[PDB]
Amino acid sequence: SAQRVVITPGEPAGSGPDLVVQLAQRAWPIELVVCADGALLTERAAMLGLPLSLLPYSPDVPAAPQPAGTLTLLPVSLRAPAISGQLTVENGPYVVETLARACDGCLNGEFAALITGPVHKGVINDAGISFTGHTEFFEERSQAKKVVMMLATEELRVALATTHLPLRAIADAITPALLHEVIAILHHDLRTKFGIAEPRILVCGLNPHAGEGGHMGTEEIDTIIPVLDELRAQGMKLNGPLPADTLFQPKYLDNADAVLAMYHDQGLPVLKYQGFGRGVNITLGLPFIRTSVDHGTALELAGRGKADVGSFITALNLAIKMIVNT
Amino acid sequence: SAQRVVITPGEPAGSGPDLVVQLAQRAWPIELVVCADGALLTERAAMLGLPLSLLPYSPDVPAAPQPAGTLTLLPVSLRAPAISGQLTVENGPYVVETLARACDGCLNGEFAALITGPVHKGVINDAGISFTGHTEFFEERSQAKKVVMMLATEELRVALATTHLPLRAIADAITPALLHEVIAILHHDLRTKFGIAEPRILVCGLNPHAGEGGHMGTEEIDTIIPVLDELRAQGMKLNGPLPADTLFQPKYLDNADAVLAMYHDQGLPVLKYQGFGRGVNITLGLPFIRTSVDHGTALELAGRGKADVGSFITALNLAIKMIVNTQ
Ligand SMILES: [Cl-]
Ligand SMILES: [Co+2]
Ligand SMILES: [Co+2]
């Protein structure tokens, strides 16, 4: 293989850097190019009592499996000292900078995948930088028509029609167009990026009991149902819209490859209730592979090796499998 | 001290009648007063090959434990013949009548509790009667300020700040006054009906990540947090607002007596996921006790013998327990 991937620790004040140094303690079949501040990684390595060596990155020198206790650095400096667990609007642009280079590298083929660590939407915004999350950032920087967020544990896959939007904004966001792009990308990436010939997708309605014919909302009639029927006519195996609290039962889940929820808190609670903090946030529809953790920056954990690299490891392993699927 | 409860089978064309006939197959420590059409029950029993004897409801004579194979009937006639799995607008008024009669009996001490079978709102509305749900029907008829819907299992209790409303109406429904009313009722009933001295309540945020400090919505900061702080200062163990996708984990659930979700699909998916179907719907804040099944009318199973009475029996046992808890 001899493949290269780029990793972004995320918020410098968070436990992101910590997790990357922790996972660098083992060797990997691919080269781990970390786009961040070198001095940031060495300081955290020291405090954690973990050895760490950084190898200069270069698109010339061919990809080489990453040696244990080492990482390949793609330099980007902070704008002020980073204190473990101490957010600061100063390094805000730094975070977004690493995300840019990381995204660009994946858009230039020099990186086969992008695995992201946790970032803080707050510090970024408070820095005057418009930010929703990696998903929108990568979707916009790679001008993709539409990308789909999908959280998956070893037992359940849950995709979302909308990401991190205020509850009041969901209803208007769910348009025939969007719902069409979302399902198209999902059904496609499941057969190609996940090797599922005939993916069976359980679709959630927007309203409880899926609007119940208008008694609890009309969006199912005005948007959801029409779309699902069009796509079903195309052979797509879509079951819904169904009541979220009905389809989220073992009897339904055991006969489907993924579930598509209309919004964040409609499909994630169940996924998290049985994920064991090992879920991976996967972005579908991008020109390149992108996985990531789904936990926060855990500020009050930075400095002390307390953060669990479990999710980060799983996200990296998953991105690696997807790469093997060319 | 034999008590009386009233049971409304629900949609006559559905499986509610069947389920009541099934639970009647065993004896009960209370008198089961069924508010429904008697021929209907008898006819359904005959279809399921189950024996059944209807004893007339007599409020002038003391209540007596319901013997196996019998129900005490509070007659309400169907407007038209009932056909298994076939809705008929004609019997829409019948359903409502049984609900109004059962509700009134609980309001005047006739019955110690009310256990409701499933009803179909579509057939009721087409009959020209405004209907949204039992919860709203009882809240309105009881002239209660507010009621709170709760789905409970033996391991997890999920109360809702709002019931079956379109998602688009939620955000503005969560007002400071609504949160106060809902939490007040939840805390009180957990203590009185569930017998929990110091209720530990987990509160969900409205927006994902509980608004993420105001960067993903401001309702938590503007309404939710202010109300919770106020109530916490009064001794209420309120933990939240927390993101729904993180609080629904054993780590948090084990140290709690109930979770308060802001809306229906925020809390029920997890509850049902592990409810094993033995979940119970309880209305809190009413002048009387009321439990119910969590499933639909199952029109296709009506009169066929495959309806699961587990939820109804769990709903009835719970009601009996609350009657004891509030003696
Ligand atoms: Cl009346
Ligand atoms: Co999230
Ligand atoms: Co419901």
Task: Return the structure tokens found at A5.
Answer: 């991937």
Q: Which of chain A's residues have a Cβ under 8 Å away from the Cβ of B122?
A: 212-213, 215
Residue with tokens 């579509």: B122
Q: Which method, experimentally, gave rise to this model?
A: X-ray
Ligand with smallest separation from the Cα of B103: 1
Measured distance CA(A268)–CA(A151) in Å, rounded: 8
What was the resolution (in A) of this experimentally determined structure? 2.1
- Residue A57 Cα, ligand 2 centroid: separation in angstroms? 32
Q: How many CB atoms lie within 10 A of CB A128?
A: 9
Q: How many CB atoms lie within 10 A of CB B197?
A: 6
Residue with tokens 């809902």: B182
Residue with tokens 């609900």: B99
Measured distance CA(A263)–CA(A152) in Å, rounded: 15
Contact A121 B215 (CB under 8 A): yes
Measured distance CA(A279)–CA(A272) in Å, rounded: 8
Closest CA to B208 of B252, B255, B170: B170
Phi, psi of B70 (to 5 degrees): -145, 155
- Residue A237 Cα, ligand 2 centroid: separation in angstroms? 27
Which of B245-267 are b and which e, b meaning 16 or more Cβ less than 10 Å from the residue's Cβ?
Answer: bbbbbeeebeebbbbbbbbbbbb
3-state secondary structure labels for all residues of chain A:
CCCEEEEECCCCCCCHHHHHHHHCCCCCCCEEEECCCHHHHHHHHHHCCCCCEEEECCCCCCCCCCCCCEEEECCCCCCCCCECCECCCCCHHHHHHHHHHHHHHHHCCCCCEEEECCCCHHHHHCCCCCCCCHHHHHHHHCCCCCCEEEEECCCCEEEECCCCCCHHHHHHHCCHHHHHHHHHHHHHHHHHCCCCCCCEEEEECCCHHHHHHEECECHHHHHHHHHHHHHHCCCCEEEEEECHHHHCCHHHHCCCCEEEECCHHHHHHHHHHCCCCCCEEEEECCCCEEEECCCCCCHHHCCCCCCCCHHHHHHHHHHHHHHHCC
Q: Which domains does chain A have, with CATH numbers?
A: 1-326 (3.40.718.10)
- Residue B115 Cα, ligand 1 centroid: separation in angstroms? 20
For residue B241, cis peptide bond before it (omega within 30 degrees of 0): yes
DSSP calls for B63-104: --PPPTTEEEEEE---SS--BTTB--GGGHHHHHHHHHHHHH
Contact A274 B273 (CB under 8 A): yes
Q: Who among B170, B216, B272 is closest to A164 (CB)?
A: B216
Q: Which of chain B's residues have a Cβ under 8 Å away from the Cβ of A267?
A: 269
Q: Which helix (H) or strand (E) holds B62?
A: none
